[PDB]
């Protein structure tokens, strides 16, 4: 179902302007000039010069040639990243300017290292549904409440690959529209945490293999060090 204006204020849409402007990936505001996304997003990206970050966007259609955007100064890919299935599918975007927090643009708290093993029960996946080369982007930002799936249950489904500790699985929902690099956000003790980053896997429905997310809590050290 459809999201409303101001519901997911940490959610951003990342655009490329080369050759033409189009939605490239999802991402989350994690600080004044820090966007957390997936490293696989940048397979075709040469330099940050071609990127635009749009905050406070409900509809892709509302993006015009007068719409305020954040320029990207640096693309930080995790140095151990090779492909999504081998993990380390995480990246930071250092913006050119600082994000001045409003009700339409605010940051999402990273997960607590004390809540490493906590089984979150209020998780959401949001995006414009861009995960494949041929898929058509959703105009309005979509949301779906997704249950977490244990790494053991996840490994059983993906016998061909290795489901590491640095991965978190979500699915077996009672079709999802997360974007590559998009957030898997869980509300714990009435506070939103960025638990996952959409990486690989099939989908969220009961009839699908679960989505494999970058387990944000395992990268808290990496994120703080890079944003220091």
């Amino acid at each position, epitope marked *: 179902t459809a999201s409303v204006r101001g519901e997911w204020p940490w959610q951003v849409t990342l655009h490329t302007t080369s*050759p033409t402007q189009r939605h490239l990936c999802g991402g989350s505001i994690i600080g004044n000039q820090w966007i957390l996304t997936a490293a696989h997003c940048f397979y075709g990206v040469e330099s940050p010069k071609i990127l635009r970050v749009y905050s406070g966007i409900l509809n892709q259609s509302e993006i015009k040639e007068d719409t305020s955007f954040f320029g990207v100064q640096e693309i930080i890919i995790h140095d151990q990243y090779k*492909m999504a299935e081998s993990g380390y599918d995480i990246a930071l975007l250092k913006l050119e300017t600082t994000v001045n927090y409003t009700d339409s643009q605010r940051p999402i708290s990273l997960p607590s290292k004390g809540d490493r093993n906590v089984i979150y029960t209020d998780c959401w996946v949001t995006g414009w549904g861009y995960r*494949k*080369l041929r898929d058509k982007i959703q105009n309005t930002l979509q949301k779906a409440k997704i249950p977490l799936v244990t790494n053991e249950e996840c490994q059983k489904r993906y016998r061909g690959h290795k489901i590491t500790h640095k991965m978190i699985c979500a699915g077996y929902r009672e079709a999802c529209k997360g974007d590559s690099g998009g957030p898997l956000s869980c509300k714990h003790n009435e506070v939103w945490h960025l638990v996952g980053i959409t990486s690989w896997g099939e989908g969220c429905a009961q009839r*699908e293999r679960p989505g494999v997310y970058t387990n944000v809590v395992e990268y808290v050290d990496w994120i703080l060090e890079k944003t220091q």
Partner: antibody, heavy 122, light 109 residues
Framework: QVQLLESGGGLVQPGGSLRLSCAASGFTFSTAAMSWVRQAPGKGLEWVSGISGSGSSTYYADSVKGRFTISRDNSKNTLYLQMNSLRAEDTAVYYC???????????????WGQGTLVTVSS | VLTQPPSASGTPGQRVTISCSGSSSNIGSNDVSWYQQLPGTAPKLLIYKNYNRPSGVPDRFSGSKSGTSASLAISGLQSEDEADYYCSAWDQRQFDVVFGGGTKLTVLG
């Protein structure tokens, strides 16, 4: 292990119709995006159509839009290509293949069938 | 539209490079794959995501990419390697997966 067995290929008159099939084994069919890729005699490869795991989304090359229809039966582990108003330039071996097309993977075909030759001749 | 030389050649135990020319819309900004097609058989995935080998593809095959071009290197050339080799990439501008016309590799000696 993984098998993709094709059948339904043969000779057809110009303007004729044919239903190609591809039976799968050794992987959970419903989880896979499936495609048809053809190869005209002594030529290279050309993607024809693709279909998602559920069957919700279907895609077609420009040369076959409104003539070919792709479908699947997940209970039967089978993929279909209903081809209508066949033309001489549709003469090729048609292979079914499991495709990967995520932004994370790139666009590739990891498992291929053996192919069925489709001949469109008067 | 990916362009490959129609033919390539080498003697046993040599290295042969099969080349693939493209553009900014395909190779220039997309993951490259390579297929081997032995006479009268279906294609087989040799390389995916530029340099990765699927399970069972020997170390002898290596993929690389530099700008709008991609290369398949076949080291320790065997007579069994005599096949058609195809490069492939998604093309954002055409909005379709594209293939090279293939290179027919001949083993001499």
């Amino acid at each position: 292990q993984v098998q993709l067995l094709e059948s339904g290929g043969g000779l057809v008159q110009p303007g004729g119709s044919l239903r190609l099939s591809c039976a799968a084994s050794g992987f959970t069919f419903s989880t896979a995006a499936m495609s048809w890729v053809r190869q005209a005699p002594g030529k290279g490869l050309e993607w024809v159509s693709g279909i998602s795991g559920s069957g919700s989304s279907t895609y077609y090359a420009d040369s076959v839009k409104g003539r070919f229809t792709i479908s699947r039966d997940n209970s039967k582990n089978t993929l279909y290509l209903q081809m209508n108003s066949l033309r001489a330039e549709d003469t090729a071996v048609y292979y079914c293949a499991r495709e990967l097309s995520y932004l994370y993977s790139g666009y590739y075909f990891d498992y291929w069938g053996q192919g069925t030759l489709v001949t469109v001749s008067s | 539209v990916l362009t490959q030389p129609p033919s390539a050649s080498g003697t046993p135990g040599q290295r042969v490079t099969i080349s693939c020319s493209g553009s900014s819309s395909n190779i220039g900004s997309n993951d490259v794959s390579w297929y081997q097609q032995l006479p009268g058989t279906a294609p087989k995935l040799l390389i995916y995501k530029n340099y990765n080998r699927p399970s069972g593809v020997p170390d002898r095959f290596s993929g690389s990419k530099s700008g709008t071009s991609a290369s398949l290197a076949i080291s320790g050339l065997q007579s069994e390697d005599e096949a058609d080799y195809y490069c492939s990439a998604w093309d954002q501008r055409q909005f379709d997966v594209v293939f090279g016309g293939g290179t027919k590799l001949t083993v001499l000696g």
